[PDB]
Amino acid sequence: KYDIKDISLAPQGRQEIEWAAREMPVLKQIRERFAQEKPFAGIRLVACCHVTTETANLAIALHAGGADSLLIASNPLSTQDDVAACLVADYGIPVYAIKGEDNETYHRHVQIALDHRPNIIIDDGSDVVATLVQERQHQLSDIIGTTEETTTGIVRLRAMFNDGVLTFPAMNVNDADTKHFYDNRYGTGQSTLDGIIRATNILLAGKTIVVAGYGWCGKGVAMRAKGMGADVIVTEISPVPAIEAAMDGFRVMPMAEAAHQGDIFITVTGNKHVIRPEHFAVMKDGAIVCNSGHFDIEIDLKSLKEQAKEVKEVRNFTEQYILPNGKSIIVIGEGRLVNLAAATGHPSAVMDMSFANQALACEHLVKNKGQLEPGMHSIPVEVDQEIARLKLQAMGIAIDSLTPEQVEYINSWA
Amino acid sequence: KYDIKDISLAPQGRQEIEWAAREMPVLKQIRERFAQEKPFAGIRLVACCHVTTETANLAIALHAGGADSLLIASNPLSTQDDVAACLVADYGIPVYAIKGEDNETYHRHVQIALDHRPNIIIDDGSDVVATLVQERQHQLSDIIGTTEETTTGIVRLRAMFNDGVLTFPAMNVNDADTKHFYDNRYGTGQSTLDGIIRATNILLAGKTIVVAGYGWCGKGVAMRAKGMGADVIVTEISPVPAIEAAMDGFRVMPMAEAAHQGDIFITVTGNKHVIRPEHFAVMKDGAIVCNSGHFDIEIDLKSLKEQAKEVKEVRNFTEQYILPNGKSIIVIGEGRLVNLAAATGHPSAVMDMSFANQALACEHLVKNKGQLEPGMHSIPVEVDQEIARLKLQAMGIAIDSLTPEQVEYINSWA
Amino acid sequence: KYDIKDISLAPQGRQEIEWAAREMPVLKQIRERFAQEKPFAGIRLVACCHVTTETANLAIALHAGGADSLLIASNPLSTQDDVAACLVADYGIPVYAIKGEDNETYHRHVQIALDHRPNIIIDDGSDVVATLVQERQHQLSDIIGTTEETTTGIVRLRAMFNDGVLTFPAMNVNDADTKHFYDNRYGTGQSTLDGIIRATNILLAGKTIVVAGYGWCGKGVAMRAKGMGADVIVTEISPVPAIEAAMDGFRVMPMAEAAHQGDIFITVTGNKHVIRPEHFAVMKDGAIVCNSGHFDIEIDLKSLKEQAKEVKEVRNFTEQYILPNGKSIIVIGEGRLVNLAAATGHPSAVMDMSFANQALACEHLVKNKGQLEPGMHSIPVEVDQEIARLKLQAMGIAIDSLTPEQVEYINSWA
Amino acid sequence: KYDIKDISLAPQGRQEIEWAAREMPVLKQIRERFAQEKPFAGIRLVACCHVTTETANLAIALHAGGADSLLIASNPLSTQDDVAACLVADYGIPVYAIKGEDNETYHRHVQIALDHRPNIIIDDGSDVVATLVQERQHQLSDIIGTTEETTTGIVRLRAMFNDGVLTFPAMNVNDADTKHFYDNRYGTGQSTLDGIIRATNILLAGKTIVVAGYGWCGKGVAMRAKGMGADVIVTEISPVPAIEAAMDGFRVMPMAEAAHQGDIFITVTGNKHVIRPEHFAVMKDGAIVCNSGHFDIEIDLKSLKEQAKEVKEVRNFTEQYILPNGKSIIVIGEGRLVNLAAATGHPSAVMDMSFANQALACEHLVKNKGQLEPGMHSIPVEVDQEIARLKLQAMGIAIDSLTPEQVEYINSWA
Numbered sequence A, B, C, D: 001k002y003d004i005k006d007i008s009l010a011p012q013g014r015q016e017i018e019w020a021a022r023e024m025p026v027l028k029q030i031r032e033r034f035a036q037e038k039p040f041a042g043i044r045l046v047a048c049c050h051v052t053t054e055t056a057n058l059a060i061a062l063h064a065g066g067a068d069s070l071l072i073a074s075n076p077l078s079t080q081d082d083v084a085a086c087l088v089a090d091y092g093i094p095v096y097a098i099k100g101e102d103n104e105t106y107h108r109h110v111q112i113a114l115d116h117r118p119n120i121i122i123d124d125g126s127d128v129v130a131t132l133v134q135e136r137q138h139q140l141s142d143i144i145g146t147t148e149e150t151t152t153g154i155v156r157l158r159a160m161f162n163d164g165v166l167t168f169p170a171m172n173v174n175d176a177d178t179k180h181f182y183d184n185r186y187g188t189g190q191s192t193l194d195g196i197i198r199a200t201n202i203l204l205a206g207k208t209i210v211v212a213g214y215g216w217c218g219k220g221v222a223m224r225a226k227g228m229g230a231d232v233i234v235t236e237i238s239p240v241p242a243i244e245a246a247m248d249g250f251r252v253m254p255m256a257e258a259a260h261q262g263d264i265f266i267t268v269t270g271n272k273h274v275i276r277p278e279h280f281a282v283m284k285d286g287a288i289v290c291n292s293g294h295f296d297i298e299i300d301l302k303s304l305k306e307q308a309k310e311v312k313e314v315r316n317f318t319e320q321y322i323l324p325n326g327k328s329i330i331v332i333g334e335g336r337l338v339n340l341a342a343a344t345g346h347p348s349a350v351m352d353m354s355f356a357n358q359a360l361a362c363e364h365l366v367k368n369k370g371q372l373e374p375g376m377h378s379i380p381v382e383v384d385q386e387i388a389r390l391k392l393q394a395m396g397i398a399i400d401s402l403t404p405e406q407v408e409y410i411n412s413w414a
């Protein structure tokens, strides 16, 4: 079966999926090869991903390869209901995903997905893999391998590995060059601001925007906020990215100092409770807070709800918390990934490369079944580099190649 | 009465109007003085504006001042139907404006507006003022003055003046410092890209974006396109702004040369047929064209429709024209103002200053009734500067002031 | 005769003058017409300019036109001694200008210039014109007109006008579009940072740089400081440019608040005592202060010297003032124009347009002798626009032109 | 003994060395510890480095640690003669380095340095290490280890390793986070443009600048050229950095296409013959070419000299080659590292971290003598991270630290 909002949205979803595919030519080439070679014949697969037009294009590629897939939502607010209807109605792919589903429904979907007995699990944040290892030790025989889309999931998998429970291969998709160099940086940079503007309509120019974290995502968000005229503050816990932020022209300071100054706060750390009650207490009246790291827990919304004497929905995706002293704190997207909650996530141009990595990582797991050591595996260099070559070609860009004399010069030392 | 889509949308419109008001503190101060002083007591007023949350806040301010106002849509795609509902149901202000109305409905609304016998007309593009002068010479005895919001309207007013038919005062709101330095540049820069992204979800980074025109709007569009990672080309007809664009790091070239290279074309010239049939024929497969100047005629869409063998709707706000050779041209928003057709227009932060100028220009017209010469009047300097002082204060920014000795130094030449 | 450092430097000066001429093609075209038409036959001329390779190219053009010219230094630190040598030895043009000359030498040079009995005076800062009006009322019968290169000179001329003593025509070269849109903004933006880096070798990335003033020069300085990775603070006295700086992404605040934070301070206001004793006392240990407005009095160096217990020369163009608490304040170029004191001033590409305006303004004065009203005259629009057309062509940039139907559309209001 | 230009320059060199040390506080702390602990007592050391004020501060730190050092120039045009005089006269350190020395003198200095019988070799480009391994196999017993400052040297060392001749430990200083993230990127970005401007005085705004290579140095040069208003073209041989360049807003193309368009060409590839005769032949008349990669061979100057019918020195650091068809090619710095040839190299702020890595890498080699495997060693993470911590502290920047609960969250997976 399936569990979706409205099957009648399938014609609209089909339209949106085809529009998204215009900038996914690398994944389109992979799909056409998969249709011929059927690498996933007889394989059962579970994908826990954001249910978007880009994920649909990945799901259709795995379907073309013969995979018996089941899809569930990575996050209650990121699901595109028209996409879910199209995958069920047009491709017969079971989808368990409703935009705005409660937590009980989400956990039921994880159980149904584990009952599919997947051989391959594509995960985004590692929730299904963690639940497999904790609750379904008796199913581990099914597992050929798993993949992990995002930085937060990679951290979880390392914790699993160090705990001695990562007893199967897991492909580190996030850390492929063609994933986090583009998706995490340029994709998040544009789509995070997109979500903020779609939720609030606010002018970014002249605002002070605080970016917590200066890794791949933070560099992108700060870069684009600056491009839109914002005064950017960066917070960090490590000195190397902190120095980078300073030399990129941004003001670096502890969050306690930034909390007095920000008009908009954006967390992209992958860590818990980066913005806390002692920070809410000193924020400007009407300060906006939002999260672009995989889990909402980066903002301590639980404490904010306790502190506040009133909460009201002021707009789509926008809630106003009123503190007992009468000052307000505006939260976008209930603290969930603001690019996917309030807009449509990354453009398909960067998801082409992220999901090419997903598709070829799944092919890698099956082709090498019985030959991969348990634990985390990076994407093979040849795969990573071929995705880049294909994407640069599809963007219409030509570059140079080394001559035999230049190759001789590199290998020379005298 | 009125002519709107659905009066049941009024509670939603009220919520949106109040959200937009948060960054209109200057206009709010004017509203509060107007409610005390009633400068528009006994005055009938027509406003032909984009029916947005920002225009609503202007209409409420004129209402507090005593104006007997009637509002019609400047453009069929920019009307926000919940705003129209709120103005009718909560303020008793007649609104003739339905999103998506046809051309005949629009011209019927203009005739209704003129039958209101306004003493003051606020216009955006000067269509109502042109109709008044053309068809209603007998009504000119009613006119205390008019105002004009946008650059294309100022150009039409100059042509009316030179034709000898501008026989009343017209306030040049567009060219106030606190209007086109901010609205036209920073407002359009953000909101134009907002409309493109809401229509297409396209990644701007890595695209070649052609901006036609490097005036106030084109400077803003190019600045923010560059900030979002695009490769920017600028076209021009005048050498001073062309040199500026070169020294700002942009490529400058004729549109015939840009036509082969652009991925996204954005017209902001105020002129007719800037993108032409001979340009469509050489564009890249899947090039996107859109317009952010007041009238759609900047793109020769009539010719495009005759060159195309087929037109498809690919998603909201987006049409795909397929040429006989199979290549596609994408049009956003039917060539209408892309920021207002596909998104919500400028943020309220800059419309605060634009519409503070409108309200104070109307006050200037009434206080000086029977004393102003016919023709175009600029916004008085003391007014323009007071809007800037109030806005800067409302942004929480403090600056310096000259000491008495520094003042003496300025007036010393020895 | 002349008064220069070393005439043996002439071959070196000739080489530098010819290098600078490569990006002065507009002025070269004017020189070639002048040599045919001789507009300055029988005219005596004084030029008080920065004695640079660019001024040399201007002097050569006036010479080709027949001018009996005499050149003196506008500023003791900006004189290039090899340029002075070449103008004397190769062109027989009297030059009174020695790099590093003392104040008494400068004032002696002004007296020599006035004894030349000029009919035309080109001034930069209006010092010679003020001396002429103040001391030489009997010579005013010689004057056909004067010109003024820089913003501070225009301000002094306005004060002369309002005092009733501007009894001849003065051409406002600074405010020509092709002057202060390019020279003042992009020229100063690059050359000011050039002077700072040549004086100090300091990394700009990661520094907080305070720019006093956000007019044409301050916009350029802030733009390029930001481009080099600095955190930029802007101070102002007027709200319109303050809002601009905020929407350009810069922090705006009073200088008293900036004084605690800046690593490098750059004054470009045209006003007196913008950096003050109460600012020195709170600056960071090792803060650098410099001036890029025409006169050094923008920084209160007199007070700094009295607050300091000791001053050391730390390298060329750089002085270290040590305060009693042991903290240091670094002054570049003794507070004189840092681009011209520590480097070579604006690139010749923008001086081409500035000094094309000078040459054509002198021609305008002579062709209209005995016909111009006393007071300030702007550069004629046809002149300003022709300079822009020639410069754009010389940069190899082609743009569009309106078709006949597009022209008709502009003049249509119906 | 020693071999320098002029011992009388020592007072000026002392001044310049002290000025440079103001932004080298990390290396100053290392020097003070070294003065106490004497890690290099009884050690002989050779450094082949650019003989700059920053290298002098490193040499003084090694001297404080008890090292018996000898310094030679890495490059004939980068030597600062006043620094060389100060090291000889004030510290008794043998320096063999004359700015502008011929190739025969440079090779003699390498022989004298090898006759010092070093135990530690600090190299920049690996020339001395290669000569040791090729010519002095009988001295390898002396060697505790070597270090390598730059990317080109690292490539050479890998070639040595793969050839089986890297029979001792070599510290990869270049690839430390606190080296190539800042030095190669932000340092080269500023100092390369500094050198171009000091040599030519050219306005960068409005020029087309071609950057060959988009690694750490290329990203910096392109970023700063764009910050100065240039239209930037990037050439590459690999698709990952090529896609990055596009998404950063730059035009990516093969060098054969860029050769027609560039006004200024900058090579930062580390490879041979990136700009070739077939490229010179299509360049604009007056195109400027320069190199910022360690060796000049990135530009085929040998072929340019053969093709040209004439060469003349048009300015300091600037040569004009005239081709038989009369077009000119301008070369800066004889194709040598333009930041060091025409200016003073990187600011001391970034060399503080690069040379902290050098100093602590030398301490690491001695502390671990007899315990390091032959081959290339990366800088230990704890050393790399401590340099960053110390530099961030000295820049006056404070950041956050993880709470115990955040640490628990990272190590958790369920």
Ligand SMILES: NC(=O)c1ccc[n+]([C@@H]2O[C@H](COP(=O)([O-])OP(=O)(O)OC[C@H]3O[C@@H](n4cnc5c(N)ncnc54)[C@H](O)[C@@H]3O)[C@@H](O)[C@H]2O)c1
Pocket: A150, A151, A152, A153, A180, A183, A184, A188, A212, A213, A214, A215, A216, A217, A218, A235, A236, A237, A238, A241, A268, A269, A270, A271, A274, A292, A293, A294, A295, A337, A338, A339, A346, D400, D402
């Ligand atoms: N919303 C999206 O579409 C999207 C896309 C990609 C990744 N992500 C998520 O974004 C987050 C960040 O990913 P990334 O690739 O940038 O990771 P990263 O490892 O590259 O960077 C994270 C950075 O945050 C810093 N940091 C950690 N804790 C911090 C704290 N308390 N305060 C300040 N800085 C802190 C770290 O020092 C590091 O520099 C993860 O949750 C990842 O899954 C979201």
Ligand SMILES: NC(=O)c1ccc[n+]([C@@H]2O[C@H](COP(=O)([O-])OP(=O)(O)OC[C@H]3O[C@@H](n4cnc5c(N)ncnc54)[C@H](O)[C@@H]3O)[C@@H](O)[C@H]2O)c1
Pocket: B150, B151, B152, B153, B180, B183, B184, B188, B212, B213, B214, B215, B216, B217, B218, B235, B236, B237, B238, B241, B268, B269, B270, B271, B274, B292, B293, B294, B295, B337, B338, B339, B340, B346, C400, C402
């Ligand atoms: N969409 C919005 O919200 C919005 C906001 C403000 C203004 N506008 C409109 O935007 C347009 C531009 O206004 P502006 O204030 O920038 O005007 P402007 O007068 O300051 O600039 C227009 C520029 O376009 C150039 N130009 C004219 N015809 C051209 C052509 N054929 N090709 C290339 N360049 C050409 C002109 O030389 C000029 O530099 C007007 O139609 C105005 O009404 C729209």
Ligand SMILES: NC(=O)c1ccc[n+]([C@@H]2O[C@H](COP(=O)([O-])OP(=O)(O)OC[C@H]3O[C@@H](n4cnc5c(N)ncnc54)[C@H](O)[C@@H]3O)[C@@H](O)[C@H]2O)c1
Pocket: B400, B402, C150, C151, C152, C153, C180, C183, C184, C188, C212, C213, C214, C215, C216, C217, C218, C235, C236, C237, C238, C241, C268, C269, C270, C271, C274, C292, C293, C294, C295, C337, C338, C339, C340, C346
């Ligand atoms: N060094 C150069 O090569 C060079 C080149 C051009 C002009 N200039 C000089 O630069 C100065 C500025 O010229 P401009 O064209 O930018 O002038 P402008 O009139 O366009 O701008 C000056 C700005 O400074 C602001 N200001 C004035 N007093 C201030 C104060 N006390 N604190 C802060 N802001 C203050 C004004 O509000 C204004 O916005 C003048 O002295 C001019 O002669 C120097």
Ligand SMILES: NC(=O)c1ccc[n+]([C@@H]2O[C@H](COP(=O)([O-])OP(=O)(O)OC[C@H]3O[C@@H](n4cnc5c(N)ncnc54)[C@H](O)[C@@H]3O)[C@@H](O)[C@H]2O)c1
Pocket: A400, A402, D150, D151, D152, D153, D180, D183, D184, D188, D212, D213, D214, D215, D216, D217, D218, D235, D236, D237, D238, D241, D268, D269, D270, D271, D274, D292, D293, D294, D295, D337, D338, D339, D346
């Ligand atoms: N001048 C300075 O002060 C300074 C400072 C640091 C490093 N360097 C030198 O700069 C050079 C580059 O160093 P890096 O750290 O940026 O190296 P890197 O390995 O990070 O980057 C080099 C880049 O050039 C590209 N490339 C190689 N051959 C090419 C070709 N033929 N055409 C185009 N692109 C090509 C590679 O794909 C790579 O992306 C080296 O020679 C290094 O020693 C100089």
Ligand SMILES: Nc1ncnc2c1ncn2[C@@H]1O[C@H](CO)[C@@H](O)[C@H]1O
Pocket: A049, A050, A051, A052, A053, A054, A055, A074, A124, A125, A149, A150, A151, A183, A294, A340, A344, A345, A346, A347, A348, A351, A354
């Ligand atoms: N349009 C999208 N569709 C699917 N996944 C997305 C989209 N935008 C972002 N993501 C992914 O979501 C992850 C965070 O949960 C990121 O690693 C990113 O790859």
Ligand SMILES: Nc1ncnc2c1ncn2[C@@H]1O[C@H](CO)[C@@H](O)[C@H]1O
Pocket: B049, B050, B051, B052, B053, B054, B055, B124, B125, B149, B150, B151, B183, B294, B340, B344, B345, B346, B347, B348, B351, B354
């Ligand atoms: N949010 C908005 N509400 C009302 N008018 C707008 C909005 N955004 C842009 N405009 C105005 O529309 C005019 C163009 O028709 C511009 O001059 C601008 O002032």
Ligand SMILES: Nc1ncnc2c1ncn2[C@@H]1O[C@H](CO)[C@@H](O)[C@H]1O
Pocket: C049, C050, C051, C052, C053, C054, C055, C124, C125, C149, C150, C151, C183, C294, C340, C344, C345, C346, C347, C348, C351, C354
């Ligand atoms: N290279 C230069 N040669 C001559 N004058 C210059 C140069 N650079 C700046 N100036 C001029 O000096 C004036 C300031 O005194 C500026 O208005 C500017 O036009």
Ligand SMILES: Nc1ncnc2c1ncn2[C@@H]1O[C@H](CO)[C@@H](O)[C@H]1O
Pocket: D049, D050, D051, D052, D053, D054, D055, D074, D124, D125, D149, D150, D151, D183, D294, D340, D344, D345, D346, D347, D348, D351, D354
């Ligand atoms: N100021 C400087 N002093 C010494 N070495 C430098 C300087 N600037 C750049 N370099 C170094 O030169 C190397 C290239 O030969 C780079 O790796 C860089 O670390």
Ligand SMILES: [Cl-]
Pocket: A030, A033
């Ligand atoms: Cl493949």
Ligand SMILES: [Cl-]
Pocket: B029, B030, B033
């Ligand atoms: Cl008011």
Ligand SMILES: [Cl-]
Pocket: C029, C030, C033
């Ligand atoms: Cl001419």
Ligand SMILES: [Cl-]
Pocket: D030, D033
């Ligand atoms: Cl240490």
Ligand SMILES: [Rb+]
Pocket: A016, A020, A052, A053, A054, A344, B201
């Ligand atoms: Rb979508």
Ligand SMILES: [Rb+]
Pocket: A409, A410, A412, A413, A414, D156
């Ligand atoms: Rb080599």
Ligand SMILES: [Rb+]
Pocket: A201, B016, B020, B052, B053, B054, B344
């Ligand atoms: Rb709205």
Ligand SMILES: [Rb+]
Pocket: C016, C020, C052, C053, C054, C344, D201
């Ligand atoms: Rb010069």
